[PDB]
Design a protein around this ligand. Structure first.
Ligand code: MAN
Ligand code: CA
Length: 472
């Protein structure tokens, strides 16, 4: 590959980051020596690799390790750990029994344990009982966070003595997935495929730890030949409330080589903003993540009610929801309310099957008019002539003249109450007849005829007359 590099002893600080206690000590370029811990108590120091490692390529790690001058019995602690995890380059494991492996997830590697921890806690499972107070080198399974020492790898090592540097070698076949560690004519082997999984890019941390007991722990003449793993960009396509609304796009590439991400076009949604990384940039050692946030496309429906009679808006129900939600709305009730008030439905554009919000607006109309009830008014003007004697006794039957009837339409607006009368129309005529007063033998009428009367209007008063007969 083009990312196949060999870390030289003089460029150590280029590819490795002194962290913790280690940051107090400069790299001595005469010896090529990096202190991890000094010979003081409760110290922690490490170097982290600035990149990650393609675990689908071969790597060869060479150097010398000073484990100190004291052994456990003389007050010597805690050892040096080599950490392999998939998380952040700048993460390191817990000190003590965790040996700088435990406390990280998906964590494996090699310890040189210069202190026996029989009492276990969360960071680490007790050290193998067969190595009570004895220096040993092992492989560690820190996948579940808790560093477990594999007793099948548990081998003794030489006690830290007069601050001496023993040769260390860690070799790795990309294709076998087998790790080979040599420390002063003790060798280790293990298939690490059960750990690398699929990640094929792990962070590397060499980490020393003192506690109550101490030791100078130091590194010298570090030769790392490995393939720089390539950076990942994750792009998530999520709604406003975090729920994912389109498949994610995990695109990988060589560090410091460009990356691009696509603003997906999502049915039912419109792009709002891109929280997180740039949508465009350069690949980097750690995972970068750009989140595309989308808004839920919202539909309009407005159902206007109109009083035709006035050409005035009665009521207007604005509805808004999500492109494809039902509205669950029916006119029927709002219609009723107007109909009961004396209105009359004309038309209803509102679909019978509720409705559904769409990316385009809907506008429906309910046409209502003030009802009008047509009645009839009738009025009658009569004429009566009473034929009587001087004592009031009837001389002759009362004449009721042919009645003069009159009709008018009455339109009552069932909303305003406003009664629009039509006109008075004469059914019978406008004029009452002449009535010649009957002749009675041996009597004389005070009026021998009642004259015909013209100009009868529907408001006219009923005519009442009285003819008195006198004897002779
Ligand atoms: O250093 C010896 C010992 O001292 C303390 O008890 C802690 O800091 C331990 O984890 C450590 O291993
Ligand atoms: Ca231990």
């Amino acid at each position: 590959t083009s990312r196949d590099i060999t870390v030289y002893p003089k460029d150590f600080l280029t590819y490795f980051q002194r962290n913790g206690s280690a940051a107090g000590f400069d790299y001595d370029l005469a010896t090529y020596t990096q202190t991890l811990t000094p010979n003081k108590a409760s110290q922690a120091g490490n170097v982290t690799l600035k990149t990650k490692v393609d675990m689908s390529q071969n790597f060869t790690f060479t150097g010398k390790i000073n484990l100190g001058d004291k052994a456990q019995n003389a007050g010597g602690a805690d050892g040096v750990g080599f950490l392999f995890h998939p998380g952040d380059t700048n993460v390191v494991g817990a000190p003590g029994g965790a040996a700088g492996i435990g406390g990280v997830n998906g964590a494996f590697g090699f310890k040189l344990d210069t202190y026996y921890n029989g009492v276990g806690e969360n960071s680490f499972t007790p050290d193998p009982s067969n190595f009570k107070g004895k220096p040993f080198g092992a492989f560690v399974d820190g996948l579940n966070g808790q560093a477990k020492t594999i007793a099948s790898s548990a081998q003794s090592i030489s006690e830290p003595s007069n601050n001496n540097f023993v040769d260390f070698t860690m070799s790795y076949n990309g294709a076998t997935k087998v790790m080979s560690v040599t420390y002063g004519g003790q060798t280790w082997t293990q298939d690490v495929s059960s750990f690398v999984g699929t990640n094929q890019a792990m962070s590397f941390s060499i980490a020393a730890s003192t506690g109550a007991f101490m030791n100078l722990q130091q590194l010298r003449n570090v030769n790392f030949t490995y393939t720089v793993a390539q950076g990942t960009v994750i792009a998530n396509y999520v709604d406003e409330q975090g729920n994912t609304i389109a498949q994610q796009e995990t695109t990988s590439g060589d560090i410091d080589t460009p990356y691009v991400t696509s603003q997906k076009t999502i049915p039912g949604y419109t792009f709002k903003a891109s929280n997180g990384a740039a949508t465009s940039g350069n690949y980097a050692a750690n995972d970068q993540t750009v989140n595309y946030v989308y808004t839920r496309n919202q539909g309009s429906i407005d159902v206007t009610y109109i009083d035709q009679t006035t050409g005035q808006t009665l009521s207007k129900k604005d509805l808004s929801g999500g492109t494809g939600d039902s509205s669950n709305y029916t006119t029927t009730d709002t219609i009723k309310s107007y109909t009961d008030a004396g209105y009359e439905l004309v038309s209803d554009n509102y679909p019978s099957g509720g409705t559904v919000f769409t990316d385009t607006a809907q506008h429906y109309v309910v046409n209502l008019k003030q009802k009008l009830v047509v009645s009839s008014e009738q009025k009658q003007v009569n004429e009566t002539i009473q034929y009587v004697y001087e004592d009031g006794s009837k001389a002759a039957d009362d004449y009721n003249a042919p009645p003069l009837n009159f009709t008018r339409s009455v339109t009552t607006n069932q909303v305003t109450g406003e009664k629009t009368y039509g006109d008075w129309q004469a059914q019978n005529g406008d004029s009452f007849g002449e009535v010649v007063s009957p002749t009675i033998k041996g009597e004389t009428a005070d009026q021998l005829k009642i004259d015909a009367i013209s100009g009868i209007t529907a408001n006219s008063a009923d005519i009442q007359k009285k003819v008195v007969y006198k004897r002779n």
